[PDB]
Coordinates of C-alpha atoms in Angstrom, one line a residue:
Chain E
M1 CA 2.0 -19.6 4.4
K2 CA 2.2 -15.9 5.2
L3 CA 1.1 -13.4 2.5
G4 CA 4.6 -12.3 1.5
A5 CA 5.5 -15.9 0.6
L6 CA 2.7 -16.4 -1.9
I7 CA 3.5 -16.8 -5.6
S8 CA 0.9 -14.1 -6.3
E9 CA 2.9 -11.6 -4.1
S10 CA 6.3 -12.5 -5.6
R11 CA 8.4 -10.3 -7.9
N12 CA 8.6 -11.2 -11.5
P13 CA 12.3 -11.5 -12.5
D14 CA 11.5 -10.5 -16.1
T15 CA 9.9 -7.1 -15.1
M16 CA 12.3 -5.8 -12.4
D17 CA 12.9 -2.6 -14.4
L18 CA 9.4 -2.1 -15.6
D19 CA 9.4 1.6 -15.0
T20 CA 12.6 2.3 -17.0
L21 CA 11.3 0.6 -20.2
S22 CA 10.1 2.3 -23.3
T23 CA 6.3 2.0 -23.8
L24 CA 6.7 -0.6 -26.5
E25 CA 9.0 -2.7 -24.4
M26 CA 6.8 -2.5 -21.3
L27 CA 3.8 -3.6 -23.3
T28 CA 5.7 -6.5 -24.8
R29 CA 6.6 -7.6 -21.2
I30 CA 3.0 -7.5 -20.2
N31 CA 1.9 -9.5 -23.3
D32 CA 4.7 -12.1 -22.6
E33 CA 3.0 -12.7 -19.2
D34 CA -0.5 -12.9 -20.8
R35 CA 0.8 -15.7 -23.1
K36 CA 1.2 -17.8 -20.0
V37 CA -2.4 -17.8 -18.9
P38 CA -4.1 -20.2 -21.5
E39 CA -1.5 -22.9 -20.6
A40 CA -2.0 -22.5 -16.9
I41 CA -5.8 -23.1 -17.5
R42 CA -5.1 -26.1 -19.8
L43 CA -3.4 -27.8 -16.9
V44 CA -6.5 -27.6 -14.7
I45 CA -9.1 -28.6 -17.3
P46 CA -9.9 -31.9 -15.4
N47 CA -10.9 -29.9 -12.3
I48 CA -12.9 -27.4 -14.3
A49 CA -14.7 -30.4 -15.9
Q50 CA -15.6 -31.7 -12.5
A51 CA -17.0 -28.3 -11.6
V52 CA -19.0 -28.1 -14.9
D53 CA -20.6 -31.4 -14.2
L54 CA -21.6 -30.4 -10.7
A55 CA -23.0 -27.1 -11.9
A56 CA -25.1 -28.7 -14.6
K57 CA -26.3 -31.2 -12.0
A58 CA -27.2 -28.3 -9.6
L59 CA -29.1 -26.3 -12.3
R60 CA -30.9 -29.5 -13.6
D61 CA -31.9 -30.2 -10.1
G62 CA -33.5 -26.8 -9.7
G63 CA -30.6 -24.9 -8.0
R64 CA -28.5 -21.9 -8.8
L65 CA -24.9 -21.3 -9.7
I66 CA -23.5 -18.6 -7.3
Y67 CA -20.1 -16.9 -7.8
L68 CA -18.6 -15.0 -4.9
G69 CA -15.5 -12.8 -4.5
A70 CA -14.1 -9.5 -3.3
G71 CA -12.9 -6.7 -5.5
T72 CA -11.8 -7.8 -9.0
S73 CA -12.7 -11.5 -8.3
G74 CA -16.2 -10.4 -7.3
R75 CA -16.6 -8.1 -10.3
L76 CA -15.6 -11.0 -12.6
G77 CA -18.2 -13.2 -11.1
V78 CA -20.9 -10.6 -11.7
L79 CA -19.5 -10.1 -15.3
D80 CA -20.0 -13.8 -16.1
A81 CA -23.4 -14.0 -14.4
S82 CA -24.7 -10.9 -16.1
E83 CA -24.2 -12.5 -19.5
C84 CA -26.2 -15.6 -18.8
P85 CA -29.8 -14.3 -19.3
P86 CA -29.1 -12.7 -22.7
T87 CA -27.0 -15.6 -23.9
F88 CA -28.8 -18.6 -22.5
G89 CA -32.2 -17.2 -21.7
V90 CA -32.3 -18.1 -18.1
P91 CA -33.8 -15.8 -15.4
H92 CA -31.3 -13.4 -13.8
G93 CA -31.8 -15.3 -10.4
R94 CA -30.4 -18.6 -11.9
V95 CA -26.7 -17.5 -12.1
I96 CA -25.7 -14.9 -9.5
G97 CA -22.5 -13.0 -8.7
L98 CA -22.0 -11.8 -5.2
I99 CA -19.4 -9.1 -4.3
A100 CA -18.1 -8.0 -0.9
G101 CA -19.5 -4.6 -0.1
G102 CA -22.7 -5.0 -2.1
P103 CA -23.7 -3.2 -5.3
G104 CA -21.7 -0.1 -4.5
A105 CA -18.5 -2.3 -4.9
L106 CA -19.4 -2.8 -8.6
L107 CA -18.6 0.8 -9.3
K108 CA -16.1 1.8 -6.7
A109 CA -13.7 -0.4 -4.8
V110 CA -14.2 -0.8 -1.0
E111 CA -11.2 -3.0 -0.2
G112 CA -11.8 -3.2 3.5
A113 CA -14.9 -5.4 3.0
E114 CA -12.8 -8.5 2.1
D115 CA -11.5 -8.9 5.6
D116 CA -14.8 -10.0 7.2
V117 CA -15.3 -13.8 7.3
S118 CA -18.9 -13.3 8.4
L119 CA -19.9 -11.1 5.5
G120 CA -19.5 -14.0 3.0
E121 CA -21.8 -16.1 5.1
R122 CA -24.3 -13.2 5.5
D123 CA -24.4 -12.6 1.7
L124 CA -25.3 -16.3 1.0
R125 CA -27.9 -16.4 3.8
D126 CA -29.5 -13.3 2.2
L127 CA -30.0 -15.3 -1.1
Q128 CA -31.6 -18.1 0.9
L129 CA -28.9 -20.6 0.0
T130 CA -30.0 -24.2 -0.3
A131 CA -28.1 -27.5 -0.4
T132 CA -28.8 -27.9 -4.2
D133 CA -27.1 -24.6 -5.0
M134 CA -23.5 -24.6 -6.1
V135 CA -21.1 -22.0 -4.7
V136 CA -17.9 -20.9 -6.4
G137 CA -15.5 -18.8 -4.4
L138 CA -13.0 -16.7 -6.2
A139 CA -9.7 -15.3 -4.7
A140 CA -6.5 -14.9 -6.6
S141 CA -4.6 -15.0 -3.3
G142 CA -6.6 -18.0 -2.2
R143 CA -6.9 -16.5 1.3
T144 CA -9.5 -13.7 1.3
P145 CA -11.5 -13.9 4.5
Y146 CA -14.8 -13.0 2.8
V147 CA -14.4 -16.0 0.5
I148 CA -13.2 -18.4 3.3
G149 CA -16.3 -17.6 5.3
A150 CA -18.7 -18.0 2.4
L151 CA -17.3 -21.4 1.4
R152 CA -17.4 -22.7 5.0
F153 CA -21.0 -21.8 5.2
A154 CA -21.9 -23.4 1.8
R155 CA -19.9 -26.5 2.7
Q156 CA -21.7 -27.0 6.0
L157 CA -25.1 -26.7 4.3
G158 CA -24.1 -29.6 1.9
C159 CA -23.7 -27.5 -1.2
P160 CA -21.3 -28.5 -4.0
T161 CA -18.4 -26.0 -3.9
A162 CA -15.5 -24.9 -6.0
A163 CA -12.6 -22.6 -5.3
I164 CA -10.7 -20.6 -8.0
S165 CA -7.3 -19.4 -6.8
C166 CA -3.9 -18.9 -8.4
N167 CA -1.7 -20.0 -5.5
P168 CA -1.2 -23.7 -4.8
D169 CA -2.7 -25.5 -1.7
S170 CA -4.6 -22.3 -0.7
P171 CA -7.1 -22.0 2.2
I172 CA -10.0 -21.7 -0.1
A173 CA -8.9 -24.8 -2.1
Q174 CA -8.8 -26.7 1.2
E175 CA -12.4 -25.7 2.1
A176 CA -14.0 -26.6 -1.3
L177 CA -15.0 -29.8 -2.9
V178 CA -13.4 -28.9 -6.2
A179 CA -10.2 -26.8 -6.4
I180 CA -9.4 -25.0 -9.7
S181 CA -5.9 -23.7 -9.2
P182 CA -4.3 -22.2 -12.4
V183 CA -0.8 -21.1 -11.4
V184 CA 0.0 -18.1 -13.5
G185 CA 3.2 -16.9 -11.7
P186 CA 4.3 -13.5 -10.5
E187 CA 2.4 -10.5 -11.9
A188 CA 4.2 -8.0 -14.2
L189 CA 3.5 -5.4 -11.5
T190 CA 4.1 -7.2 -8.2
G191 CA 0.9 -8.3 -6.5
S192 CA -1.3 -6.9 -9.3
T193 CA -3.5 -9.9 -9.4
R194 CA -6.1 -8.1 -11.4
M195 CA -3.8 -8.9 -14.4
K196 CA -2.9 -12.6 -15.1
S197 CA -4.9 -14.0 -12.2
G198 CA -7.9 -12.0 -13.1
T199 CA -7.6 -13.2 -16.7
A200 CA -7.4 -16.7 -15.5
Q201 CA -10.5 -16.2 -13.4
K202 CA -12.4 -14.9 -16.3
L203 CA -11.4 -17.8 -18.6
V204 CA -12.5 -20.3 -15.9
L205 CA -15.9 -18.6 -15.2
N206 CA -16.6 -18.5 -19.0
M207 CA -15.8 -22.2 -19.2
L208 CA -18.0 -23.0 -16.2
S209 CA -21.1 -21.1 -17.4
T210 CA -20.7 -22.0 -21.1
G211 CA -19.9 -25.7 -20.3
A212 CA -22.8 -26.1 -17.9
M213 CA -25.3 -24.3 -20.1
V214 CA -24.3 -26.4 -23.2
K215 CA -24.8 -29.6 -21.1
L216 CA -28.2 -28.2 -20.0
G217 CA -29.4 -27.9 -23.7
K218 CA -29.1 -24.1 -24.0
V219 CA -27.1 -24.4 -27.2
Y220 CA -27.6 -26.3 -30.5
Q221 CA -24.5 -27.2 -32.5
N222 CA -22.4 -24.0 -31.8
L223 CA -25.5 -21.7 -32.2
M224 CA -27.0 -19.6 -29.4
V225 CA -30.5 -21.0 -29.7
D226 CA -31.6 -19.7 -26.3
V227 CA -30.6 -16.1 -26.9
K228 CA -33.0 -13.6 -25.2
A229 CA -33.2 -11.1 -28.0
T230 CA -34.0 -7.5 -26.7
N231 CA -32.0 -5.4 -29.1
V232 CA -31.2 -5.0 -32.8
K233 CA -28.1 -7.2 -32.8
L234 CA -29.6 -10.0 -30.8
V235 CA -32.9 -10.2 -32.8
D236 CA -30.9 -10.1 -36.0
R237 CA -28.8 -13.0 -34.7
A238 CA -32.0 -14.9 -33.7
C239 CA -33.2 -14.6 -37.3
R240 CA -29.8 -15.8 -38.7
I241 CA -29.7 -18.7 -36.3
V242 CA -33.1 -19.9 -37.5
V243 CA -32.0 -19.6 -41.1
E244 CA -28.7 -21.4 -40.3
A245 CA -30.5 -24.3 -38.5
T246 CA -33.5 -24.9 -40.8
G247 CA -32.2 -24.0 -44.3
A248 CA -35.4 -21.9 -44.7
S249 CA -35.7 -18.3 -45.8
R250 CA -35.2 -15.5 -43.4
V251 CA -38.8 -14.5 -44.2
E252 CA -40.3 -17.9 -43.0
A253 CA -37.9 -17.4 -40.3
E254 CA -39.0 -13.9 -39.4
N255 CA -42.7 -14.9 -39.4
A256 CA -42.0 -17.9 -37.1
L257 CA -39.9 -15.8 -34.7
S258 CA -42.5 -13.1 -34.5
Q259 CA -45.0 -15.8 -33.4
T260 CA -42.6 -17.3 -30.8
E261 CA -41.8 -13.9 -29.2
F262 CA -38.4 -14.2 -30.8
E263 CA -37.6 -17.6 -29.1
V264 CA -35.4 -19.5 -31.5
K265 CA -35.9 -23.1 -30.4
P266 CA -39.6 -23.3 -31.1
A267 CA -39.2 -21.4 -34.3
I268 CA -36.7 -24.0 -35.6
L269 CA -39.2 -26.8 -34.8
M270 CA -42.1 -25.0 -36.4
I271 CA -40.2 -24.7 -39.6
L272 CA -38.6 -28.1 -39.7
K273 CA -41.7 -30.1 -38.6
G274 CA -44.5 -27.8 -39.9
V275 CA -46.2 -27.5 -36.5
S276 CA -47.8 -24.6 -34.6
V277 CA -46.1 -22.5 -32.0
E278 CA -48.2 -24.2 -29.4
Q279 CA -47.2 -27.7 -30.6
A280 CA -43.5 -26.7 -30.8
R281 CA -43.6 -25.5 -27.2
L282 CA -45.2 -28.8 -26.0
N283 CA -42.7 -30.9 -28.0
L284 CA -39.8 -29.1 -26.4
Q285 CA -41.3 -29.6 -22.9
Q286 CA -41.6 -33.3 -23.6
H287 CA -37.8 -33.3 -24.4
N288 CA -36.8 -31.2 -21.5
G289 CA -35.8 -28.4 -23.8
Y290 CA -33.3 -30.3 -25.9
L291 CA -33.8 -29.3 -29.5
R292 CA -31.7 -32.3 -30.8
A293 CA -34.0 -34.7 -29.1
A294 CA -37.1 -33.0 -30.4
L295 CA -35.7 -33.3 -34.0
Chain F
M1 CA -20.8 -4.7 -43.8
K2 CA -24.0 -6.2 -42.4
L3 CA -24.0 -7.8 -39.0
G4 CA -24.2 -11.3 -40.4
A5 CA -21.0 -10.9 -42.4
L6 CA -18.8 -9.9 -39.4
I7 CA -16.0 -12.2 -38.2
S8 CA -17.4 -11.9 -34.7
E9 CA -20.7 -13.3 -35.9
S10 CA -19.2 -16.2 -37.9
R11 CA -19.3 -19.9 -37.0
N12 CA -16.2 -21.5 -35.7
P13 CA -15.4 -24.5 -37.9
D14 CA -13.7 -26.3 -35.0
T15 CA -16.7 -26.2 -32.7
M16 CA -19.6 -27.0 -35.1
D17 CA -20.6 -30.0 -32.9
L18 CA -20.0 -28.3 -29.5
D19 CA -23.2 -29.6 -27.9
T20 CA -22.3 -33.3 -28.7
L21 CA -18.9 -33.3 -27.1
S22 CA -17.9 -34.7 -23.7
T23 CA -17.3 -32.1 -21.0
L24 CA -13.6 -32.6 -21.3
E25 CA -13.5 -32.2 -25.0
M26 CA -15.8 -29.1 -25.0
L27 CA -13.5 -27.5 -22.5
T28 CA -10.4 -28.3 -24.5
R29 CA -12.1 -26.6 -27.6
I30 CA -12.8 -23.5 -25.5
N31 CA -9.2 -23.4 -24.2
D32 CA -7.8 -23.9 -27.8
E33 CA -9.7 -20.7 -28.7
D34 CA -8.3 -18.8 -25.6
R35 CA -4.8 -19.7 -26.7
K36 CA -5.4 -17.4 -29.7
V37 CA -6.0 -14.3 -27.7
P38 CA -2.5 -13.2 -26.5
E39 CA -1.1 -13.5 -30.1
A40 CA -4.0 -11.4 -31.5
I41 CA -3.0 -8.7 -28.9
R42 CA 0.7 -9.0 -29.7
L43 CA 0.0 -8.0 -33.3
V44 CA -1.6 -4.7 -32.2
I45 CA 0.9 -3.6 -29.5
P46 CA 2.1 -0.6 -31.7
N47 CA -1.5 0.8 -31.6
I48 CA -1.8 0.1 -27.9
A49 CA 1.5 2.0 -27.4
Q50 CA 0.1 5.0 -29.2
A51 CA -2.9 4.9 -27.0
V52 CA -0.8 4.5 -23.8
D53 CA 1.2 7.6 -24.7
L54 CA -2.0 9.6 -25.4
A55 CA -3.5 8.5 -22.1
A56 CA -0.3 9.4 -20.1
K57 CA -0.3 12.8 -21.9
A58 CA -4.0 13.3 -21.0
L59 CA -3.5 12.4 -17.3
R60 CA -0.3 14.5 -17.0
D61 CA -2.1 17.4 -18.5
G62 CA -4.9 17.2 -15.9
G63 CA -7.5 15.2 -17.8
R64 CA -9.2 11.8 -17.3
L65 CA -9.1 8.4 -19.0
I66 CA -12.7 7.4 -19.8
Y67 CA -13.8 4.0 -21.0
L68 CA -17.2 3.5 -22.5
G69 CA -19.1 0.5 -23.8
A70 CA -22.4 -1.5 -23.6
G71 CA -22.9 -4.8 -21.8
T72 CA -19.8 -6.9 -21.4
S73 CA -17.6 -4.2 -23.0
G74 CA -19.0 -1.6 -20.6
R75 CA -18.5 -3.9 -17.5
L76 CA -14.9 -4.5 -18.5
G77 CA -14.2 -0.8 -18.7
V78 CA -15.7 -0.4 -15.2
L79 CA -13.6 -3.4 -14.0
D80 CA -10.4 -1.8 -15.1
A81 CA -11.3 1.6 -13.8
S82 CA -12.3 0.3 -10.4
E83 CA -8.8 -1.1 -9.8
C84 CA -7.0 2.2 -10.4
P85 CA -7.6 3.9 -7.0
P86 CA -6.4 0.9 -4.9
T87 CA -3.5 0.1 -7.3
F88 CA -2.2 3.5 -8.3
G89 CA -3.7 5.8 -5.6
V90 CA -5.5 8.1 -8.0
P91 CA -8.9 9.5 -7.1
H92 CA -11.9 7.5 -8.4
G93 CA -12.8 10.3 -10.8
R94 CA -9.5 10.1 -12.7
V95 CA -10.2 6.8 -14.5
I96 CA -13.9 6.3 -15.2
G97 CA -15.9 3.5 -16.9
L98 CA -19.3 4.3 -18.4
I99 CA -21.9 1.7 -19.3
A100 CA -25.0 2.0 -21.4
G101 CA -28.0 1.9 -19.1
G102 CA -26.2 3.4 -16.1
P103 CA -25.4 1.6 -12.8
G104 CA -28.2 -0.9 -13.0
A105 CA -26.4 -2.4 -16.0
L106 CA -23.5 -3.4 -13.8
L107 CA -25.7 -6.0 -12.1
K108 CA -28.3 -6.9 -14.7
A109 CA -28.0 -6.7 -18.5
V110 CA -30.3 -4.2 -20.3
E111 CA -29.3 -5.0 -23.9
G112 CA -31.7 -2.6 -25.5
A113 CA -29.7 0.4 -24.3
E114 CA -26.9 -0.1 -26.7
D115 CA -29.0 0.9 -29.7
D116 CA -29.2 4.6 -28.9
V117 CA -26.5 6.7 -30.5
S118 CA -27.5 9.7 -28.4
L119 CA -27.1 7.9 -25.1
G120 CA -23.3 7.7 -25.5
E121 CA -23.1 11.4 -26.1
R122 CA -25.4 12.1 -23.1
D123 CA -23.3 10.0 -20.7
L124 CA -20.1 11.9 -21.7
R125 CA -21.8 15.3 -21.4
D126 CA -23.0 14.2 -17.9
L127 CA -19.3 13.8 -16.9
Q128 CA -18.5 17.4 -18.3
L129 CA -16.1 16.0 -20.9
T130 CA -13.3 18.4 -21.8
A131 CA -10.9 18.3 -24.8
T132 CA -8.0 17.1 -22.5
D133 CA -9.9 13.9 -21.5
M134 CA -9.2 10.8 -23.4
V135 CA -12.1 8.6 -24.4
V136 CA -11.8 4.9 -25.3
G137 CA -14.8 3.2 -26.9
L138 CA -15.2 -0.6 -26.6
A139 CA -17.3 -2.8 -28.8
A140 CA -16.4 -6.3 -29.9
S141 CA -18.6 -5.9 -33.0
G142 CA -17.2 -2.5 -33.7
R143 CA -20.7 -1.2 -34.6
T144 CA -22.6 -0.6 -31.3
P145 CA -24.6 2.6 -31.7
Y146 CA -24.0 3.8 -28.1
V147 CA -20.2 3.7 -28.7
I148 CA -20.4 5.3 -32.2
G149 CA -22.3 8.3 -30.7
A150 CA -20.0 8.6 -27.8
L151 CA -16.9 8.6 -30.0
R152 CA -18.4 11.1 -32.4
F153 CA -19.1 13.5 -29.5
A154 CA -15.6 13.1 -28.1
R155 CA -13.9 13.6 -31.5
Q156 CA -15.8 16.8 -32.2
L157 CA -14.7 18.3 -28.9
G158 CA -11.1 17.6 -29.8
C159 CA -10.5 14.7 -27.4
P160 CA -7.9 12.1 -28.1
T161 CA -9.9 8.9 -28.8
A162 CA -9.3 5.2 -29.1
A163 CA -11.5 2.4 -30.3
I164 CA -11.2 -1.3 -29.2
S165 CA -13.0 -3.7 -31.5
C166 CA -12.4 -7.3 -32.7
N167 CA -13.6 -6.9 -36.3
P168 CA -11.4 -5.2 -38.9
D169 CA -12.2 -1.7 -40.4
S170 CA -15.1 -1.2 -38.0
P171 CA -17.3 1.9 -37.7
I172 CA -15.8 2.7 -34.3
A173 CA -12.2 2.3 -35.6
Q174 CA -13.1 4.8 -38.4
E175 CA -14.3 7.4 -35.9
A176 CA -11.3 7.2 -33.5
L177 CA -7.8 8.6 -33.6
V178 CA -6.2 5.3 -32.6
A179 CA -7.8 1.9 -33.6
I180 CA -6.9 -1.1 -31.5
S181 CA -8.3 -4.1 -33.5
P182 CA -7.2 -7.5 -32.2
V183 CA -8.8 -10.1 -34.5
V184 CA -9.5 -13.2 -32.4
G185 CA -11.7 -15.1 -34.9
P186 CA -15.1 -16.7 -34.5
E187 CA -16.2 -17.5 -31.0
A188 CA -16.6 -21.1 -29.7
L189 CA -20.3 -20.3 -29.3
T190 CA -21.3 -18.3 -32.4
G191 CA -21.5 -14.6 -31.6
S192 CA -20.6 -15.1 -27.9
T193 CA -18.2 -12.1 -27.9
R194 CA -18.1 -12.1 -24.1
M195 CA -15.5 -14.9 -24.6
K196 CA -12.4 -14.3 -26.7
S197 CA -13.3 -10.7 -27.6
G198 CA -14.0 -9.9 -24.0
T199 CA -10.7 -11.4 -23.0
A200 CA -9.0 -9.3 -25.6
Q201 CA -10.7 -6.2 -24.3
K202 CA -9.6 -7.0 -20.8
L203 CA -6.0 -7.5 -21.8
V204 CA -6.0 -4.2 -23.8
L205 CA -7.6 -2.2 -20.9
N206 CA -5.0 -3.6 -18.4
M207 CA -2.2 -2.7 -20.8
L208 CA -3.6 0.9 -21.2
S209 CA -4.1 1.7 -17.5
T210 CA -0.9 -0.1 -16.3
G211 CA 1.2 1.4 -19.1
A212 CA -0.1 4.9 -18.6
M213 CA 0.2 4.8 -14.8
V214 CA 3.8 3.4 -15.0
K215 CA 4.7 6.3 -17.4
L216 CA 3.1 8.7 -14.9
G217 CA 5.4 7.6 -12.0
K218 CA 2.8 5.5 -10.1
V219 CA 5.2 2.5 -9.9
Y220 CA 8.8 2.1 -8.9
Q221 CA 10.8 -0.9 -10.4
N222 CA 7.9 -3.5 -10.6
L223 CA 6.6 -2.4 -7.1
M224 CA 3.2 -0.9 -6.4
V225 CA 4.5 2.2 -4.6
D226 CA 1.2 4.1 -5.0
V227 CA -1.0 1.4 -3.5
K228 CA -3.9 2.9 -1.5
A229 CA -3.8 0.5 1.5
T230 CA -7.2 0.1 3.2
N231 CA -7.2 -3.6 4.1
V232 CA -5.0 -6.2 5.7
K233 CA -3.5 -7.5 2.5
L234 CA -2.7 -4.1 1.0
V235 CA -1.2 -2.6 4.1
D236 CA 0.9 -5.8 4.5
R237 CA 2.0 -5.3 0.9
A238 CA 2.8 -1.6 1.6
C239 CA 5.1 -2.7 4.4
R240 CA 6.8 -5.4 2.3
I241 CA 7.3 -2.8 -0.5
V242 CA 9.1 -0.5 1.8
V243 CA 11.4 -3.3 3.0
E244 CA 12.0 -4.5 -0.6
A245 CA 13.0 -0.9 -1.7
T246 CA 15.1 0.4 1.2
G247 CA 16.7 -2.7 2.6
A248 CA 15.6 -1.6 6.0
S249 CA 13.7 -3.6 8.7
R250 CA 10.0 -3.9 8.5
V251 CA 10.0 -2.2 11.9
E252 CA 11.6 1.1 10.6
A253 CA 9.3 0.4 7.8
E254 CA 6.2 0.2 9.9
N255 CA 7.0 3.3 11.9
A256 CA 7.6 5.3 8.7
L257 CA 4.4 4.1 7.1
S258 CA 2.4 4.9 10.2
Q259 CA 3.6 8.5 9.9
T260 CA 2.9 8.8 6.2
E261 CA -0.7 7.5 6.5
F262 CA 0.5 4.2 4.8
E263 CA 1.8 6.1 1.7
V264 CA 4.8 4.1 0.4
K265 CA 6.7 6.7 -1.6
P266 CA 7.4 9.1 1.2
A267 CA 8.2 6.3 3.6
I268 CA 10.9 5.0 1.2
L269 CA 12.4 8.5 1.0
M270 CA 12.3 9.0 4.8
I271 CA 14.3 5.8 5.3
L272 CA 16.8 6.1 2.5
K273 CA 17.5 9.8 3.0
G274 CA 16.8 10.2 6.7
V275 CA 14.3 13.0 6.3
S276 CA 11.0 13.8 7.9
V277 CA 7.6 13.0 6.5
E278 CA 7.1 16.6 5.7
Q279 CA 10.5 16.9 3.9
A280 CA 9.8 13.7 1.9
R281 CA 6.4 15.0 0.7
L282 CA 8.0 18.3 -0.5
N283 CA 10.9 16.4 -2.2
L284 CA 8.4 14.3 -4.1
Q285 CA 6.4 17.4 -5.2
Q286 CA 9.6 18.9 -6.5
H287 CA 10.1 15.8 -8.6
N288 CA 6.5 15.6 -9.8
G289 CA 6.0 12.4 -7.8
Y290 CA 8.7 10.3 -9.5
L291 CA 10.5 8.4 -6.7
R292 CA 13.5 7.5 -9.0
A293 CA 14.2 11.2 -9.6
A294 CA 13.9 12.0 -5.9
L295 CA 16.5 9.3 -5.1

């Protein structure tokens, strides 16, 4: 299809007079569109599940999860990736977001960069992509050249790949192993895919990283046991997690966390089993980091 | 309240066994939580409207719209601001997103930066904040020191201010003129405010910038007439907008756009009124840029 025929580029029949509405009305129209996004995602949960299982397999097998997009799509990938080290304790190189135009594009849009198919390939080669790594290409339109080129390169190397787009049967969906295609409909402002489509992309990325990290043992119950606590709020949360999980005083909790360099998993073990920091770390290694299995 | 008592830090009773669920189940739990976000935003539309009207007033009166947050909240402000120049044609300095820790924080989290109340003030002073500028502070928790300090500084200068938080009666809501407080409930992963709270923040920022820019005349009907077209997709959209708005051939459209340096508003006028580029630009200046008023 040509660009002008895409659903993402179509006019929304419920906002044709957007600029003549009162502020309240206009905002209610936008919110009516936002209401559509969680259902669009619900319909593609099976595909997202396939992608979560591939991502978990990739990270377990020593690879990385790499998000790639231009503009908004690229910034959303960087947004999700940036949250993985503080939330799940992984090194920053484990989950990576790439954006067309490089770091400057994080702060100021450079819309021309998206047109180069070879740039997506170049950015992946610059990270020394391997067949174990998983690559997720994001483009609301489903046709951004930067993303097409990146996915083609990853596919030929043997990487598991996923494509997130909001138009059906898109070029990027055709290139990828797993297609995640939440159809959100025409945007309130015609072609403004930063809106519903961007929201959908965010929901999918949060599902991918959270789903994979939970499968990898980086959570316990619904508690953030692999938090990397480097500020007041996070260290306070680390203390509260230990108390929530052991049923022991925050004091025994604080003394154990101090010894573990604020690492929650070994602190919980120390308290529940009455073992040393050193013994707790070895026990967790024996169980591949899964606290449930160590308890 | 203490941190551990906040709704954002509370356990979600529907995800207590998150780590024992099948991938499909886990994803359905996350999506059930996402479903809650558009309704939480709907309940605070009146407050968002107040903020849209203040932002429009600020930009009309020659000021800027400045978003400020740490971590995810900060990256979301930069995400929304980055989209304003290509979508609404404004200079990049008109809508600005600030993040604790500076540009490095856009790519790699530096969670310790959020604890300094004086850093928020410093970042605003570095932009030469004036009383006409509007400052929007974002913190899911509602208590991030960087944001508290920033809002205090803006308030004392006489700036209109808004606070976006997901906990009720928060410190930042108390400091600001307008409080936007969508209560989304406990996160699927306890304390993981990048999830629902982050989604809420995104929806609110998109409402603020879109709402204000529509009020300022940067849209016509539901068409992106102030698009800054610097790539294939955007220039193609510019052509399609002219055809959609004039009922003239894409050819007359392409010739007019070439003459206007791909600026849609004057091209539409040229075609509908049969005037020169020069005459079209003057007519738009006489009508303060509002295409409807010039037609």
